[PDB]
Amino acid sequence: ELSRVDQRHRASQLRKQKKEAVLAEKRQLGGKDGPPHQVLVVPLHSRISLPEAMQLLQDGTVHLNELGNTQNFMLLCPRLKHRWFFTSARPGDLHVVLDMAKVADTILFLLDPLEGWDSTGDYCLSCLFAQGLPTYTLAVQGISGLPLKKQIDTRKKLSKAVEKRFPHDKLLLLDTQQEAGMLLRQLANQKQQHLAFRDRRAYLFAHAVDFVPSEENNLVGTLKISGYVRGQTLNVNRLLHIVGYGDFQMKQIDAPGDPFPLNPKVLMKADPGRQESLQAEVIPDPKVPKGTSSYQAEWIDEEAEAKMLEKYKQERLEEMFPDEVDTPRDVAARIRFQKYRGLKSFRTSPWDPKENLPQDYARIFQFQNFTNTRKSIFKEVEEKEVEGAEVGWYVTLHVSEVPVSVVECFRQGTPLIAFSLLPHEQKMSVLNMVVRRDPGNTEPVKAKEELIFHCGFRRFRASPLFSQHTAADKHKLQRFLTADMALVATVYAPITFPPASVLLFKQKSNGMHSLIATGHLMSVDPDRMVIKRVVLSGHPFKIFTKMAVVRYMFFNREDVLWFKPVELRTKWGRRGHIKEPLGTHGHMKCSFDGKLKSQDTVLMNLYKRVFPKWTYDPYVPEPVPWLKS
C-alpha cells in the first residue's frame, strides 16, 4: 500500500462506499417511499395467549384490518418514522403460517417463560427453518409475573432452553408498553435477512379483495387484489400465481390512493395481446411324420396395518440386501426382466439419454442450456428495468379467469399471497430436488408414493423418484427414502428457477400433514438418468479351481443364454462370467478370477431407466391443525 496517508485514504474511501450501500439497503423497508414492514407474529407455546400480546403491541396510529378468523392490524408511527403491518399466525396451522412467513419481513416468536416451545411449536419451527427464515426476534411474556428470585433463574433456564435452535440470540421480554416501544425500536433497526426467492420475483400480500363474476353459472369472473407490491417491478404481461390456487393471467393494473400513507382510480397498464404470456403447461401437438418328436426331427382397517408391517419388512430387507430380487420360478427371467440390461461399469459404461423415452416426455419442456437461460433471465430482471408498477406502490390487480372459492377463503381468514413469475415458469418439465429426511418422522416412504411438495411458493401433490446424489450421468434409484442420506427426488412439475426451498409432507390421517423431508431445488432437466437396479443371486454349489457350477439364479436353459453377456460378481470380491448352461434347468458354468469359497454367493446386476409418473395435481387439501400422536 505504502505511504500511511494513502492507505488511510484508501480505507476511508472503502468505508464511504460500503456505508453508501448500507444506507441504500436500509431505506427500502418501512419508510415513506418504501412499503410497510411486514411482521408475522407466532406464539410458539400453547400457553401463550396472542391477543393480549398484540394489544400490547398495537401501542402511533392503528388501522385494523379484519377477516373472519385472522385479526391483523396496521401500525404507523413518526416516533420511529416507520410503518409496520402486523399479522398473527397459529403454529400447527401449516398453510397459513407457511403462506404468510414467505411474505413477512420479520418473524416475532413468542415464548413461554417456563418451557421453551410447544411440541407443535417445534413442528412449526422446523417447517420455518426449512422453508426459509427471514429476520427473527425472540420475545417472552410471563417473566414479570414472578418474584425476582424466580425471574433470574427463569431467564437463565430459557436462555439454556432455546440455544438448541437459537444458539446466541438475545431474547427480549414483553410485558409493558415501554417494553413494547423498546421491542418496536428493536424491530425497526435490524440487519434484514434477505430471502432470494422473494427477491427475484414480484410478490404481493392481499390487503383487500373484490370479486365480480362474468357468469355466476360459470362461477368465474374477474378478481381485484389490492396491496403493496414487494419484489421487483410488476409487469402485466407476465402471469400471476396465487399461492394455493395456481397460475393464471392478470388483465389490468391500476393504482388507487395509498390508504395508510406514512405522513399525510388511474389505470396504469392494460395487457397487450401479442406481448402477453400464454397459458400453456404442456405441448399441444401430440415334412414331418405323425408321432415323432423334435429330438428325432433334427435327424429327418387392519389391512392398512398389514401393508404397514409389510412396508416395515421391505425396508428392513432393502438395507440388509440393497437391491436383491428373488427370480420368479414361473415367469421366465428374460420376460420379467425383459427391459433390463447389464452395465460393465455403472460409472463409465455408456447410456443413451434419449434411447427409450416414454409418452410423457412428449408433453414437457427441455432446456438447450439451462444455466445460460437462467443467467439471462436474472440479468434481465436485475440489469434491465421494466415500465410496470414499481416497488412499494399500493396497487390493485384485475385478474381475469379465477374461480369463486378464493374469495370466501379470503373471508375465512386465509391470507392471499400472489407472486409474478419469471418467463418459462408455467410450463411442465422434470424437477430434480435434493432432499434429506427429518428426524421427527420415521415412517417408511417408498419410491413412487404420493407426497406433498412445497417447492418455492408452489404447493402440489406428486409421486417422486429417489436417486443417489452423485456427479455421474447415471444415478441409481433408491427404493426407500433413507434416514440420514441426501437424495434426489425427481418428478414432473412446472419449472421453477433455483434457488427455492423444498418441503415434503405426507397426508397422515384425518387431515394431518406430517413433515417427512426437506431440502432445496437443484437444476431442472429430464436428461437426468435414474436407473433401477435388480441384483439376481445364485449359489455356487460345485466349486473347482477357477470354475464353478452355480444354481438357483435362473431356472431355464435359455434364461442363462439371454443373460450371458452380463459380468457376474461375488459377495467376497471375485469377478467372473458365464460360459455354458449345463442342465435343462438353470444350472450354469462360470469362470472366475480366483478360487471361490463354498460359503460364497454369486450375483449379477441388471439395470433399466425408470421415469417418474405423471400424477401432478395442483390441488392440495387444507390441513387440520397439527398435534403429536
Binding site: R363, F367, Q368
Partner: peptide
C-alpha cells in the same frame, strides 16, 4: 437369436423428444 446385449441395438433414440427451449 437375441440376448441381453444385442437387443439394445433395436432401441431407436429419435422418437419421443421433449420440446427444446433454445438459448
Amino acid at each position: 437369436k437375441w440376448d441381453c446385449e444385442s437387443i439394445c441395438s433395436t432401441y431407436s433414440n429419435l422418437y419421443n423428444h421433449p420440446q427444446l427451449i433454445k438459448y
